[PDB]
Every structure is written in C-alpha cells, then in structure tokens.
Amino acid sequence: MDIHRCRFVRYPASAINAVAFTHSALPVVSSSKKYLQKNIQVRLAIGRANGDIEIWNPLNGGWYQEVIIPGGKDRSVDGLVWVTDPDEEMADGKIIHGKSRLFSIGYTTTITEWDLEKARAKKHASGQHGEIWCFGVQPLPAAQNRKLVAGTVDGNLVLYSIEDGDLKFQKTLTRTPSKKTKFVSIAFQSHNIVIVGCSNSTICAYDVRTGTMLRQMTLGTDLTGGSKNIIVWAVKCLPNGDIVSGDSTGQVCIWDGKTYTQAQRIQSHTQDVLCLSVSADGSKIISGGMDRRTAVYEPMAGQSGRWSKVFHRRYHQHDVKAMASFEGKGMSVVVSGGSDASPIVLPLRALGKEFHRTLPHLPQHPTVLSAPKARYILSWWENEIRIWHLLNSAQQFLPLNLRKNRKFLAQVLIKGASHITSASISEDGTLLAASTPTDVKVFHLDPLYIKKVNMTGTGLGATRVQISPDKRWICWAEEGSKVMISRVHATESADGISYTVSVPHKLHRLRRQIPKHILLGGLGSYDRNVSQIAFSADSRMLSVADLAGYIDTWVLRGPAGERWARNPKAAMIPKLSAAPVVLSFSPTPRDDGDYDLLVVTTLKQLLIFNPLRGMLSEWSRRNTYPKLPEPFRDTRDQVKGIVWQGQRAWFYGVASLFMFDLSQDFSKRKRGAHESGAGSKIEKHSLVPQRIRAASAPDGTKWEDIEMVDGSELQRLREENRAKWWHTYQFRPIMGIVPIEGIPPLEVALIERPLSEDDLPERYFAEGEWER
Amino acid sequence: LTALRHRSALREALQGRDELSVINILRWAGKYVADPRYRSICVDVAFHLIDLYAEHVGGSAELATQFQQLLAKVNREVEKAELAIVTGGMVESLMMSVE
C-alpha cells in the first residue's frame, strides 16, 4: 500500500444556519415500554449557507448523516421548522406516530415545505410582503388545525395554514407601527400568545386570535458605545411561563410572563448572543454567540425567578448561529451549528459530566472518485467537477517534483443553477456522469477534450448514479427511491469511441412488508430512498440499499438481449438491523460463481453475503460482532468507505483507519456504562466531583461511596464448522481514500480537508472585545 | 519601544505582522538605526524582524529590496561607527599632549 496525502482540494465549508430536531423531547417511559417507544423516528435537520439541508439520525449516540439535499446558486437558508402531529391510535389500539412535515425559509417572501421522500422541495407559498426573518409553528393545546407564524423585515406577521398537507398563507396578524422595526426572533409562550424580539430594541407580545397586542418590552441603548439600536437576537420561553431573551450586547434577560416584565439581566458574553436553548423540563439555559463561546445557567436555590451563570466555554471555532435541543429515550443533548462547518453536540443532563462530540464537518458521502486506470481523481461541489491527474507512481519518487506530479487538470461547470448531487466515472475515465435533482448528464472525455453526451428519458434528476465497470450500464437512484437503468452502447468510428444511451429501463424494487401504522406514522414512506448502490466487478449483479436496511439485488440475464431480472435469493437476503453505510462487491472472484458482498451498517456491523445463495458467507458465520476488535467496536466513527485488497480490506471513517484480513479470524472506551448520546465521561477535571466518600467512624478509617444520581451452542457449531488487523487515527480530517494503479500492492490517494481561518469567515471586532 | 522591551512583549508585538506592516516597520527601522541614541533598541527590533520575516524574502522581492535597503544604510553605518573611533582616538592623547 502506497499512500499519497493531499490537501489541495479546497472543499468549501458553509455556515450552518439551522439546527432542528423533529422532536424537542419524548415522554419518558421505563424499560418495559421501550417496545412501544422503539418505532419513534427521531432525526435532526440542519441547514447550511449554501442552501444545503441535511438530515441526520441521532441513533442514541450514532449521528449518521442520512441525506444531503443541496439548493441552487444564490440560495441559502436561515430557518427550519418541523411539524409533528400528536400520535394517533388506530381502532385496535395500534399507534400511528405524528407525521413530521419539514418547512424552511430561503431568504424570500416564500416558505418552502420540503419532500424528503422524493428528496426535493415539495411546496412553496408566498405572501405579498417583505422578507421573512423568523418563523415557527403554533404549539399544541388545535388538534388538526395548526398554523405557521412568520415575521419579516417590514414587520407584518404573516400566518399560514398547515393541514391536509397544505401550505397556504392565510393572513396578517399585525405589523409593527414603525416603518423602522424588523422582526428578528420568534417564540410562543402559549398556544395563542406569541413573543417576538424585534430590531428597535423591542420584544412585542401579541395574541394570535384577533391579532391583538398584549405588551411591549424594551431594551436600552447599548452602553457599549454607539449603535443605539439593541438587536433582540433571540427569544425562548420557559415551560412554566417565564420568558428569556438574548440580545445584542451579549447580555441575556429574564422576564416574568404573567406581567411580561423583566426580573433580571445577566452580562454573559462580550459580543452578541446568536442562539439560546432551554432544558426540556425548563431547568438549564444555554447561550451561544460570536465570541465562539457558549454558556450554561441554572436557577439560584432559594430566591425564585433568579438565575445565574454556571459557566461558559468556547466549543466552536466560529460563531454558534443556530442550535436545537432534544431530551428523549435517555439522550439529553443539544446540537450547535455555526460557520466552522462542524456540528458540536453536548449533553444536557450530563453537562459538565461527559465530553462533547465534534461531528464531522465534511459530508457523509466521500464525494471523491478515481479512475485508477486513468489515475484521475474527482471531486464535485456547487456547480463544478474538478479533476486532477497524478501522472506518476510513488516508487519513482522513492520533493521538488511532487508539485509537477500533481496537476490541476480539468474543471467543468454545469449549466443552469442546479447542484451536482452525485457523480460517476468509468474505470478508464472516458465516461463521466453528473447527477443533479433536475437532470443527469454524461460527458465523454478524450486525453483534454470533453463532449456532452445528452440524455433522453430523464428530466427529473436522480439522487445516486453509478456506471458499470465494463462501461455498458448506467444506473441511478432517481428521486431517492426509484432505481432506474439505461444501457449505453459504445460504437467505434474513425475518430474514436462514441457512446449512445438507450431508453432508461425501470427495474421494480421488492414489495417489502411493513405494517400500515408504520407506513403512515413517522416520516411515512421515507427511508425507502436509497443510499448505496453497487455493480459487481463484472457488472453481472446489481445491489441497492436504502436508509431502512433493505437490500434489493438484481441479476443480468444475457440473450441486445441483456436485461436485468430479479435475483430470487434477494427474498432470502434479510433486512439489516441498521442502515448499511458501506457496501461493496468483492473484486476478487469466488470459485462457485457466487459473489461476496461486504456490508458495514452504522452500528459498525461488518458482514459478507453470498447473495446467489441468499445467505451470509461462512467467514461471516464464524467471525461475529463480539469477535470483532475493540478499536473497531468503539470508534464513534461512521465508516466512510472501503478500499479492497487481495485478502485485506482497508476501512476508513472520517478520523479512523483499519485494515482487516478477510481470510483470517479474530480473537479505553467503556461498554456497560450508560451515558447521553455524546462523548465519553470525564475522568480528570470536571465541574462535577467524581469520588464522593462519606465518613462514619470518627477515626476516619471507615468510609462510604455516596453515588451521585438524580450462544454457547451457537459458537460450538460455529467452531466445529472449521490475527491480521490494524488501526490508526493519525489522519484526522480524511475526506477521501481512493485507489489507483500503475494481497497486491496498490497506490491510493488520501485527500483531507483541515479547517483554517482562511477557509473560515473573518471575525469582526469593535474596540472593547479585542481577543488576546 | 522601550516600554515593549521593558514589559517583554516586543516578540509578541512583531510576530503577527503582514507584508505591508513589516514594510512600514522596516522602513522606520532603516530610517532610525542611524541615531545612536536609540540604535540599541532599534537593532533589537531589527534582530527580531530578521528572526521573524526572513522566510518570504524570495516570495516578495520588494521586501527583499527593503531587506537590502536595511543593509544599504548599514554598510555605511559601519563607517560611521568606525570613523567615530578613528576620530575617537584623534582627541584622546592630544589631551595627553597638554600635560
């Protein structure tokens, strides 16, 4: 293995503008109702300043980046709202969960509901007014009659309906009297009492029924100097009735709600507050701001309505633009997103008791491709595809010549304003394919010269795209869930090779067996969108897997009489316990004509199929998950991908690396301890104490420890049917590990993306706050 | 500058500069070595800027010329200090010839 590290691929970051849990909390049950609370679909939606809305699954500490949908050019986001109905009970007591609808704002007069099943924007709805600068749903007491409230720049509170799957602007509640007031932060103290922080240093309290004005709260001048408008950056409501609001001086104010007047001011940050969070029981307060710094606050014992800061700390490296908190199924967390592209999640109930978690700033898909025969590396973003050729091996160099060794070869820019979802290349690099949510396009390349192979039959885009290794099949995940393939024919002529695509042929996925209440509740027909696709090394077998854990495979029957039929053993292929993150055929062929399918799911579940037998390989029957090594079992790192060897497989997450010998069998992070869904516990220096020793017996020799709390037969058979593994974390920001040629030896490109202040936006300072 | 050597933060004061900033500071230095009344403090700062911004003299040749125009006064600053002592001996035993 010869490795080439790379940092010249400037994958641009984007400022997270929205963090949004699909639930703020779940009602707490014991262990005996876990079977009831199992099928609750809980996710986290995030919006970044390139208009990218991405959904992750918490997975009780997993945080698998499920889907990324990017928006077009000059398209950002700033807000995000989930709309979950209360839970339904069927006629026989079966539970239908609340269908959670997703809404966003695209810095327009328009609010956009998004469809994640077809993976695009579902609906827009626009009123004739200014531009919306905060919005949210009316809370729950009505039952089926819920509404959307949106405040804007001119002021006028616009009111939308959300029921019967409709998104229509109804009417204006009220506009500000002044023409100089901007509505900047929204919250709801009651079902019908709305509290909005607003640019002219006000927090206006309205009632939504007749659009009336309860009260106004005032904020002074910033005695930090000029700019005598205070900007009420955030408002949040305590569940008991009090109101808290973060502001422009970095202060935070606490307001009694039954009279809507301030009981207390706290001077916390030095520059502005940008976001707040409250514990789901209404106990802890979190304040994150552009001093790249965030604090937590508790109620004072004794005196009512008085709170104080417990502490503060810098977690991020840029501001903390948005956040969202969750407290459910034993996981109390808050996710904070800013502009350094790295989400940071914190425990709520174990704050100061467990370490945080820096999620990968880079996307789940590696977004790096290689034609190893051509030694071409590939990376796409907003409209362009960028290609480098390496033109040399590593043993030739084994300083001054590595600069000529790498080369910025090519850069193509897509037309229109869409974004490249995915891309595929042929093994020799002569065929390129770019997939947008609007269309898919192919480009033939001659070593450059690029021509546009035009696609017929499409017109609706696709989510995933693969090209067969023999350069005959092009398959795509169209609209997430719709797998569809077209043959391409390579006709030679005196100028060279040319390629004509046939009609897209549809291949019907298998009718899976899901109960109707599960099909309706949650996000509905959602996980059916697929995440991973694979042709065999000879492109005779196709296999696809979704976010649910289902895998549908297909065989290619020859007589162009070639057509793909269903593999009958796909029925015997069972559904995975988790979402498969990586799947790949073995390029080393078997001896019985079957294939060997290596799959890893997001619980790091490693296994291998003999799919024509419809069963696991015997090596997977032997090596179990308890047989797996602990540095792979404890990673807290979703496996970004695999590269193959003859008898080895080299795995990589985002910060981790492994190699395993698939021929051989196999024989710090704690396991039985129970935490929140982020980080390990503290060991050395935590604000909570660790050893609490009571002392009876006045000689001090007798003490106490006061706790601080609020297949044997199967392995017999699997051994009667009858190491080389390695790991490191010495390549932290891995964004791509792609093979190239020129147990066999292979060259490989390890491209990373460290974050710098140069990539980062710049920090603005007035005279007072000048950081040391 | 006496204050920033006395409270020891000249190194902090100069280690974070940019191209144009060291252009200005070098221009001040090259202007003001020639006064011996603060030549010591100035050459301390000159030592520090040598330690801190000699790397990109090839990356930015206009600053290399400024690095040169540092010398381009200094090569005659040897002659001022030397001819000082050349004159410095011319006085001392004419005083001895008095007695």
Binding site: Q251, Q264, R265, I266, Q267, S268, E298, M300, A301, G302, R306, S308, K309, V310, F311, G352, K353, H685, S686, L687, V688, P689, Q690, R691, I692, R693, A694, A695, S696, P698, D699, G700, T701, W703, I706, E707, M708, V709, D710 | -
Partner: protein, 276 residues
Amino acid sequence: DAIEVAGKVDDVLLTLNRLTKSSAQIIAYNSKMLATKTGKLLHTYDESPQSLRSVAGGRAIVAAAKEALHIGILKTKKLASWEELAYRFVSFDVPDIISTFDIRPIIAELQDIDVAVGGARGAIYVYSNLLAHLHTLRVGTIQPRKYHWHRRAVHSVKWSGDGNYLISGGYETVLVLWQLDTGRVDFLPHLSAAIENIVVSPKGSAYALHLDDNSAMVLSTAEMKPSMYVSGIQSLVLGDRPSKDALVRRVWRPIDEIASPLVATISPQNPSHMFL
C-alpha cells in the same frame, strides 16, 4: 467557636493536628478539656490537609484538603451532653487545587450554607446548597458555579455582608468583586501589592485588606478610600507559609529566598527616619 454544652455557651477549640505528613486529625477541646489536654477526636483524613473553619456555633465544620473537602454536620441537636459531639462527614473532590475558601451560613436556625472556594489556577467554585445536597446512599447531582478571572493564584475570597457580592483579591493586585446578581464584575483595580488577605466588618461597612508589602488598609463600602491606613517595614520575608501560587508548577516557581542583603540608609538631620 461558642456552643451550648448543656445550657451554657462556652468556647470550644478545634485543633487540626498532623498525624503523618499527608494526613491530619481534628480534635475538639473545652476550657477544662484543654486544661486536661485530652480531646474529642472528630475526623482524620488522609489527603495533605490544609485547613478547617466552622460556622457560628458548632453545627457545621469544614476541612480543606488539597483537592477534596470534608464537611462535618453535628449529628444531634441542642447538644444536651458534652460527649455526644459527633459530626457526619462526607468527602468530595474540588476540580481545582484549593487555595482558600469562605462560607456564608444561611440562617434563627442554620437552614443552609453557601461556600465559595478559590484555587491557585485563578478560579472560584461556589457551591449553593451543600446541606440540602448532602442531607439526602444517594445524592443529587451537585455542580458549583464557575468564576474564572484571575490569571495567577487567588489568595483571599469572602462574602459581602448580606452576601450579594463575592469579594476577592489575589496575586494580580486587583480587588475583584463578582456581582452575583448579574453577570458583571466590579473591581478596585490597582493595589500596591498582591492581595494577601481580605476580611469583612461586622456591619457591611468596612473592608480590611492585608497587602503583600506588609500593609493593611481599612476602607468603607462604596467609598473605597483609605479610612484606616497602616504599613510596616515591607522587607523581604522568608515565608512561614511559603506562597499561594507555589502549588501548580509555574514557569518560574517563586521561592522564598533572599539573594542579597537589604539596601538602607538612616537619614542624617533626622535619624528617626530610614530609607530602604
């Protein structure tokens, strides 16, 4: 302290005496019990003991270990007989290296206590309700409120009268005052030396500081002006108690030493005076 043995309140003396170097023991004495020089052994603890204070009366005592703290709560009430003088103890580790501390007793009973503790990292942990948190085997999750301002060691931390201000001072010659009702700080910023010690008047009126250059200043509140001023010889002293920042391995560890004799001249024409 002053406690009621049967019906008479008298002075009890609590002596913290080392038994090894890394351990010590606390022993209570009456007047007659100190005369007979026998004592009531209350607690021995084994982590490099520093100090001990107690509340008014004798309900609660507090021993300062290096990283932990021991709290003794008198088991019986009203103290009928002398011999039933027993204190329930729980130990627990402060996250920083303890330099000093103060307590306000939340009160005609003793309903609670609130303890501020200062450490040489430059930090103040205030614990809100220790008696209610440790009266309840199992206890709830305790967490102090953090207060970091000073870079070097903090030396002297106390409460302001009705306890609304966390008053303090240390090495960096700034009398610092945590606001504790809002997020602000108020400081009398430039003293002549490191703040060795802070003490409070019986009323909330008069502060008195001992300052590292052998000095003492008694001020009145919000006047902050020298209302009583005393200074001493200010000489270089070999410190009995060595230093409060000599605990966490600074770049230069300050060492009690005298490398040169002192420079001084008596004034002629006025031999009653001397410059030094």
